[PDB]
């Protein structure tokens, strides 16, 4: 499939599969097996999803060699500081049953981010992490982290969908050599995205679904995407986007949908800071 080269030279797939918090462990593990069988090699989890053990089990069941898989996980904020980042990272490796991860991200822009980053630089230099990055950082926070540290984040994973398009933040990242990676590309169906008349009409041009149109739009902007489903047939649809292309006119009509509004919440809202930093997880 198609990859992009990160700023440290490593290749990352452009199409990935993300897991999320799930009531049932079995469904999570079977989904990752199905995603690998479907052709996904980039697999994304996080310590806070509390499913790393299931993800690790699924990799063992997949029959695919370790060196062909690109595994991402993320540090949860109760350990965003120097000693904590190393402790939780080792817990994550143990749960995942891995000796290294391909990409490790700070999950949220909260806590002692600089201390956690220094730890992550050391873990990378120890050969335990192929690339380090962050998630949900605005450009100000990225510029701050770069100004004071040695390694520039390889990836910043942020919400990208047709109502929250990151029209400036994506070019700002790319201009600094940071690879954007999209989560919630479908805005979890919020605001009637699946029935949106513009996206539907573009899809009918190519015999593609709204979801395929959206993932193709993300791809054409040079952004890595994470798509989730627990149904194998949807996974097969989501990955099958390398056989068509959106025109300039199509891309224009999609850009016009932007409201620069998260489907979820703002990471700059102090109530969301207060809420997330108060969560206590056994990870």
Q: What is the DSSP letter of 118?
A: H
**In total, how many domains does the chain have?**
1
- CA neighbor of 75 nearest in space, from 151, 134, 160, 153: 134
Q: Which residues of 116-134 are buried (b: 16+ CB within 10 A; e: fewer)?
A: bbbbbeebbeeebbbbbbb
Instruction: Specify whether 49 is catalytic.
Output: yes
Query: DSSP string covering 123-184, please?
Result: HHHTTSEEEEEEES--HHHHHHHHHH-SSPPSEEEEE-BTTB--TTHHHHHHHTTPEEEEE-
Residue in 40, 49, 81, 82 annotated catalytic? 49
Domain that holds residue 118: 2-283
List the binding residues for substrate: 107
Instruction: Return phi, psi of residue 5, to 5°.
Output: -85, 125
- CATH number, domain of 44, equals 3.20.20.100
At what resolution in Å was this solved?
1.8
Under 8 Å CB-to-CB from 163, ≥6 apart: which residues? 187, 190, 191, 193, 257, 258, 259, 261, 263
Inter-residue contact 107 to 135 (CB < 8 Å): yes
Inter-residue contact 25 to 51 (CB < 8 Å): yes
Query: CA separation (Å) from 227 to 31, 181, 265?
Result: 12, 11, 20
Q: List the structure tokens of 185.
A: 């590309």
CA–CA separation, 259 and 100 (whole Å): 39
List the binding residues: 107
């Amino acid at each position: 499939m198609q990859t992009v080269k990160l700023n440290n030279g490593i290749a990352m797939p452009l199409l990935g599969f993300g897991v999320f918090q799930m009531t049932n462990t079995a469904e999570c593990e079977r989904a990752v097996i199905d995603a690998i069988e479907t052709g996904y090699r980039l697999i994304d989890t996080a310590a806070s999803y509390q499913n790393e053990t299931q993800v690790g089990n699924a990799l063992k069941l997949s029959g695919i060699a370790r060196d062909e898989l690109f595994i991402t996980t993320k540090l949860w904020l109760q350990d965003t500081y120097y000693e904590g980042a190393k402790a939780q990272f080792e817990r994550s490796l143990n749960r995942l049953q891995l000796d290294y991860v391909d990409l490790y991200l700070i999950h949220q822009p909260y806590g002692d981010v600089h201390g956690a980053w220094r730890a992550m630089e050391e873990l990378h230099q120890a050969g335990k992490i192929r690339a380090i990055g962050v998630s949900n950082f605005h450009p100000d926070r990225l510029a701050d982290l770069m100004a004071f540290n040695k390694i520039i984040p390889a990836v910043n994973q942020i919400e990208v969908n047709p109502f929250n398009q990151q029209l400036h933040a994506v070019p700002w990242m790319q201009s600094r050599g940071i690879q954007p990676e999209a989560w919630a590309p479908f805005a979890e169906g919020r605001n009637g995205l699946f029935q949106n008349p513009v996206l539907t009409a573009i899809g009918e041009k190519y015999g593609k679904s709204v979801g395929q149109v959206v993932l193709r739009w993300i791809f054409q902007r040079g952004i890595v995407s994470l798509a989730k489903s627990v149904r194998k047939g949807r996974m097969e649809e989501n990955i099958n986007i390398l056989d068509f292309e959106l025109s300039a006119e199509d891309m224009l009509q999609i850009a016009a949908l932007d409201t620069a509004t998260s489907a979820f919440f703002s990471h700059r809202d102090p109530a969301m800071v207060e809420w997330l930093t108060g969560r206590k997880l056994d990870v």
